[PDB]
């Protein structure tokens, strides 16, 4: 009973957080096995961020210039290399708390938990979606760089995001764990356009199924629609077009509730065209798109 914006338990990730300092800049690093991963802008001063030449800035740094600390644990740096927008600092000690892990590049519309950190210390955990325009609407202040996003499947942490930057608009941008930015962003202090964003249609439908399962069903109607007709409405309301692949991933929710995906689409169509009429769905007065069909199945069945 009930449905919440739930994050993964952050324990396995807290054990990997370290503080990385280079010169006057301090940010967060991720210590997995004998490597510490952090945003490459740790080598910059505030002045360098206008148009940094990272290759040149990194050449002025030696292993002993990277100070890596995890509480009373001072790590000895024996190698450094830049891979895309991340620095990889080889340390002489493997992290005894390294969980089973993978590095994954998530798709837009997928969700993950963020463990927000400052000075290598965890401050909080929250669940979010990678927006269709490759930004995330997180909660990050100065010092949060290097905080990571992840998913967990039983004992395996799949790291998908490392925080790098706040855009002038207050939204966030970062990379996968190989240092490749999600979206068109560059690690420079320059105004950068984020694409037009859309609402994640498949996630809104998944959340409507979660609402029906938990008792909120006032939005169910006597109508149906087609993928074509629904997509004309989705275009009008800046929603992602629904594909048969999205219908297919909603199959378990459709099967559990007995509500055909196109019938749920007709409810979403009427909610888009008429609004919520001052009513709520799972404690929200807007259409929620930060729950994937898999999140709903996991939460509704109590997967640990």
Catalytic residue positions, numbered? 41, 145
164 binding partner (options a copy of itself, ligand M93, none; Cβ < 5 to 8 Å by kind): ligand M93
164 near ligand M93, judged by CB under 6 A: yes
Nearer to a copy of itself, 32 or 77 (CB): 32
Contact 184, 55 (CB under 8 A): no
Contact 131, 111 (CB under 8 A): no
1 near ligand M93, judged by CB under 6 A: yes
Give the separation between CA 54 and CA 44, rounded to whole angstroms: 8
128 binding partner (options ligand M93, a copy of itself, none; Cβ < 5 to 8 Å by kind): a copy of itself
Contact 182, 173 (CB under 8 A): yes
Task: Restricting to residues 46-85, name those near ligand M93 by CB under 6 A.
Answer: 49
41 binding partner (options a copy of itself, ligand M93, none; Cβ < 5 to 8 Å by kind): ligand M93
What is the distance, to the nearest Å, from the Cα of residue 202 to the centroid of all Cα atoms in its chain? Answer: 17
How big is the chain, counted in residues? 304
Give the separation between CA 112 and CA 131, rounded to whole angstroms: 11
Give me the 166-205 binding string for ligand M93, x by CB under 6 A, dash otherwise: x--------------------xxx----------------
Binding part of the chain for ligand M93, among 158-166, 193-201, 213-221, 228-236 by CB under 6 A, reads 158-166
* List 53, 72, 74, 142, residue binding ligand M93 (CB under 6 A): 142
304 binding partner (options a copy of itself, ligand M93, none; Cβ < 5 to 8 Å by kind): a copy of itself
* List 37, 112, 118, 140, residue binding ligand M93 (CB under 6 A): 140
189 binding partner (options a copy of itself, ligand M93, none; Cβ < 5 to 8 Å by kind): ligand M93
Give the separation between CA 276 and CA 219, rounded to whole angstroms: 8
49 binding partner (options ligand M93, a copy of itself, none; Cβ < 5 to 8 Å by kind): ligand M93
- 235: which 2 tokens? 């275009």
- 57: which 2 tokens? 């800035």
| Total chain residues near ligand M93 (CB under 6 A) | 14
What is the distance, to the nearest Å, from the Cα of residue 290 to the centroid of all Cα atoms in its chain? Answer: 10
| Phi, psi at 225, each rounded to 5° | -145, 180
> After which residues does the chain become discontinuous at a C–N distance over 2.5 Å?
none
Q: Tell me 110's DSSP state.
A: -
Give the separation between CA 214 and CA 202, rounded to whole angstroms: 19
Residues that bind a copy of itself (CB under 8 A): 1-11, 14-15, 115-119, 121-126, 128, 137-144, 166, 170-172, 214-215, 275-276, 278, 280, 283-286, 298-304
* List 59, 78, 94, 141, residue binding ligand M93 (CB under 6 A): 141
What is the distance, to the nearest Å, from the Cα of residue 82 to the centroid of all Cα atoms in its chain? Answer: 23
Instruction: Catalog residues that contact ligand M93 under the rule CB under 6 A.
Output: 1, 41, 49, 140-142, 144-145, 164-166, 187-189
């Amino acid at each position: 009973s009930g449905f919440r914006k739930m994050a993964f338990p952050s324990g396995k990730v807290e054990g990997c957080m370290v503080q990385v300092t280079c010169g006057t800049t301090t940010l967060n690093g991720l210590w997995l096995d004998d490597v510490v991963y952090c945003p490459r802008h740790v080598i910059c001063t505030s002045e360098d961020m206008l148009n940094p030449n990272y290759e040149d800035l990194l050449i002025r740094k030696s292993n002993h210039n990277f100070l890596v600390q995890a509480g009373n644990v001072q790590l000895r740096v024996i190698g450094h290399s830049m891979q895309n927008c991340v620095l990889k600092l080889k340390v002489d000690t493997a992290n005894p708390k390294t969980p089973k892990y993978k590095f994954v590049r998530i798709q837009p519309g997928q969700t993950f938990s963020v463990l927000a950190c400052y000075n290598g210390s965890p401050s909080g955990v929250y669940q979010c979606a990678m927006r269709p325009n490759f930004t995330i609407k997180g909660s990050f202040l100065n010092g949060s760089c290097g905080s990571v996003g992840f998913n967990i499947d039983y004992d395996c942490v799949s790291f998908c995001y490392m925080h790098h930057m706040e855009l002038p608009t207050g939204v966030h941008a970062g990379t996968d764990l190989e240092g490749n930015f999600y979206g068109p962003f560059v690690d420079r202090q320059t105004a950068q356009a984020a694409g037009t964003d859309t609402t994640i249609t498949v996630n809104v439908l998944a959340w409507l199924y979660a609402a029906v399962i938990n008792g909120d069903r006032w939005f169910l109607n006597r109508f149906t629609t087609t993928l074509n007709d629904f997509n004309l409405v989705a275009m009008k309301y800046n929603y992602e077009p629904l594909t048969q692949d999205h219908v297919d991933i909603l199959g378990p929710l459709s099967a559990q509730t007995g509500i055909a995906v196109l019938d749920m689409c007709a409810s979403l169509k009427e909610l888009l065209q008429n609004g919520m009429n001052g009513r709520t769905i799972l404690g929200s007065a807007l259409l929620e798109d930060e729950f994937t069909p898999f999140d709903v199945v996991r939460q509704c069945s109590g997967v640990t």
